[PDB]
Design a protein around this ligand. Structure first.
Ligand SMILES: *Cc1c(COP(=O)(O)O)cnc(C)c1O
Ligand SMILES: *Cc1c(COP(=O)(O)O)cnc(C)c1O
Lengths: 405, 405
């Protein structure tokens, strides 16, 4: 069982004040605050063991290399990949999706083929596929939404066919909180020979993620949402697919040999996908974030967060003219609009109360268009958030509505 | 005037011991140690002001956004770019070169065209051009080296012609220490309508860099070599060229609008080249590294470093059978081989003495091939290195040669 007070004492920003008021940080879905264990693991690495990492002969450099490869192995166990070598270090979910779209996409999606996405995808899981489709002459097909924020799965028989090469689908919506039925959609996709990329940016901090039970072909996530540093993320690819993928970025460390008269040859997976100096400091920080989350326990985190979400939805019923978007069983985020007030104004008043929510289109324009709204407000309810912060949000929305209505 | 003792007291790793001995870190050309001002600027940002940055309405997020854009402006002044908007945040020099090669390269280099590089380039400034040439059917031409480690500039009339679209050239060699005559080569390139990309990864920490006096079209460098965090670098592009470049990575924040029925449109430069959450922590750290270096003064750093280099070359004359590679006026690095001993063995003995040097091909295979050696050892002599560390290197090479000869 979980202790929110003990957890909160590890996060230094949660003591801050904003506008003279105590911060209520409800925007973890945009980026999470980091525990002092993560902040300090990175700072200690810079203060005591820093060096370049490409298997340098000297001591600091050989030990930094081993730290980096141990982080690769730990992340691989965290998502239950069969091996550390199925994981590539990237800048974040966005970069991982771009790597797949170019490296796998340019050789496997041809003129006349199709790719399937959904109407709830974040721009990171839309734009790279629009670019791939435009480069190769393929078609981009879209699984539509239902009013409750779930996918219309009955449309799948019209979207999947013999030309469907990939399904790119979000694990958990960053706006709606919907968890998609990935295992079943992947079974479906594989019956047609299509591969499946899963955008897990909003899944890995809420519950255990097992890529071998999912059977996904590609899985991506970002460290800064998982209580870790910015600039680091993970791309998981089944070994047999990764081994056949050609390099995306070129440069040092991804090569086996470089010649100006005989050409260049590439090293093996995963190192063929990592050109130049990696983000070593971010990788040390990400390992520490995975150890911190694992020590708390993702099933404990999930129980606390679900309890907090039930509490907030129950209290939000006393806000007049509140519109919520998404299913009742939503994870992590609450997307809402208040009466006829523009989200930008509701968010500005909430910020004047010390409450940080996100407002706007949340990098999901197609989703805003589905709901016929230009924008929404969104409250994130993470493992360090409390009942008292939920009460402050409810009181604030009641005050706002009283004032502007 | 410079004080090495005061400077060294800012770098916590320089107090470390390795193998029970006092560390002599002579591998700054692979990656530099970081001052506590840089380490702490990043850690303080995570402890007190962390938030997502895409002009979020709440306070923390709006202040993190302004910090990031102020770092863009400071880096732009550091290299004397005409505006902050000519600078793109990337993971490092390698990623910046890949961005240029795809985004500028795919639209401006056609079948039958040629691109010019040099035989001393690092793999980061070779491989992306080999990939571009293979995608578009162009030719890769090479400026050869002279035995003293300088370019054979008399071969330029045979390499530049009416089909030459780009010159990609290193400012300062990471192995030889050669500083290339960039301004004159750029004048030459522009007479043919060719653009010039400069790899400045080993230039920005040794002396003032002015991109408007160079007149280069593209300029790239990495923060981790400039006493800053890993995972962050800078790509500078003349405004008129950048404004016409199409996006490379796609995703959130680089878009103006996203539609599944009307297509997607892009935001303006530089933001069109930055997809997804940036490395905010690395950007805060990079600003701090630029302030630290600027407070010391690059002309002061250059005077101290040149004095230290003169001292080392003069003392290295008492090492029997030492071979040096590169010009006498080399900057930052000393590349050498000891008698007939393999560099790997010399580097292993130097490490057993607490001395960190780099050994191998230094991500410059063509350069090793030119000199008909498989590998070299390399000592870096940065602003925090001392006469006493140089004496330890000289004594160690004499001891090694006595032992193994
Ligand atoms: C180190 C280096 C690079 C690559 O830098 P990363 O920081 O590894 O991207 C490119 N060119 C030169 C001359 C270098 O020294
Ligand atoms: C945040 C997010 C992304 C993009 O992550 P970056 O860390 O910005 O690359 C992609 N998908 C979803 C669902 C997200 O929430």
């Amino acid at each position: 069982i979980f202790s929110v007070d003990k957890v909160r004492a590890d996060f230094p920003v949660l003591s801050r004040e904003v506008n003279g008021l105590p911060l209520a940080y409800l925007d973890s879905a945009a980026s999470a605050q980091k525990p002092s264990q993560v902040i300090d693991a990175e700072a200690e690495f810079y203060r005591h063991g820093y060096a370049a990492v490409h298997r340098g002969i000297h001591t600091l450099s050989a030990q930094a290399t081993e730290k980096m490869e141990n982080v690769r192995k730990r992340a691989s166990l965290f998502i239950n990949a069969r091996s550390a070598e199925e994981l590539v270090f990237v800048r974040g979910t966005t970069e991982g999706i771009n790597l797949v779209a170019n490296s796998w996409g340019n050789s496997n999606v041809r003129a006349g083929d199709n790719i399937i996405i959904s109407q709830m995808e974040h721009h990171a899981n839309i734009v790279p596929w629009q670019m791939l489709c435009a480069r190769v002459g393929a078609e981009l097909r879209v699984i539509p939404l239902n009013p409750d924020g779930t996918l219309q799965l009955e449309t799948l028989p019209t979207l999947f066919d013999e030309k469907t090469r990939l399904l790119a689908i979000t694990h958990v919506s960053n706006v709606l909180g919907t968890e998609n039925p990935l295992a079943e959609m992947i079974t479906l996709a594989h019956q047609h020979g299509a591969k499946v990329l899963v955008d897990g940016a909003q899944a890995v901090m809420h519950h255990p993620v097992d890529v071998q039970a999912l059977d996904c072909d590609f899985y991506v996530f970002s460290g800064h949402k998982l209580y870790g540093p910015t600039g680091i993320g993970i791309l998981y690819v089944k070994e047999a697919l990764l081994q056949e993928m050609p390099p995306w970025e070129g440069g040092g460390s991804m090569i086996a040999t470089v010649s100006l008269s005989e050409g260049t040859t590439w090293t093996k997976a995963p190192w063929r996908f990592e050109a130049g100096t990696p983000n070593t400091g971010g990788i040390i920080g990400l390992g520490a974030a995975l150890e911190y989350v694992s020590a708390l326990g993702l099933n404990n985190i999930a129980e606390y967060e679900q309890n907090l979400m039930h509490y907030a939805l129950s209290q939000l019923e006393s806000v007049p003219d509140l519109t919520l978007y998404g299913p009742q069983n939503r994870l992590g985020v609450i997307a809402f609009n208040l009466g006829k007030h523009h989200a930008y104004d509701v968010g500005s008043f909430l910020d004047n109360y010390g409450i940080a929510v996100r407002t706007g289109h949340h990098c999901a324009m197609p989703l805003m268009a589905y709901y016929n709204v230009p924008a929404m407000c969104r409250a994130s309810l993470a493992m360090y958030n409390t009942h008292e912060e939920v009460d402050r949000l409810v009181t604030g929305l009641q005050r706002i509505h009283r004032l502007l209505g």
